[PDB]
Amino acid sequence: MKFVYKEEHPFEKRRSEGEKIRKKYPDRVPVIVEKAPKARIGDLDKKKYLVPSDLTVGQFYFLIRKRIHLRAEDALFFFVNNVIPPTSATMGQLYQEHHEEDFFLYIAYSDESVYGL
């Protein structure tokens, strides 16, 4: 899965920012959130989020939903490595399994239940 953030900032610079931010906010996990390709859904003003490690994915759904102004009638799916993470998992658990080598967790969001559809 492609992230514009990774295309626009090179790896070394991302990695050195990730080191600084894990040290500054050790209790929080750094999350890059981006709209999935071909998604038909509100745009997200900002990509970079610091979130408590014990926040659940379900709770993160609520936070993102509100920022894109979705009615609870509308659907929202997260993807991490092309896979919908469990709603009950915590962002800390996601980070440990799926952080990337720049120390960031990458989450794509979409209105469709399959990434890239």
Binding site: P30, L50, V51, P52, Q59, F60, F62, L63
Partner: peptide, 18 residues
């Protein structure tokens, strides 16, 4: 370029509606 550090109340609102 700056990070969104979600506030303790918006976190608390999310823990309620969940």
């Amino acid at each position: 370029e700056e990070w969104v550090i979600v506030s303790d109340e918006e976190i608390e609102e999310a823990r309620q509606k969940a």
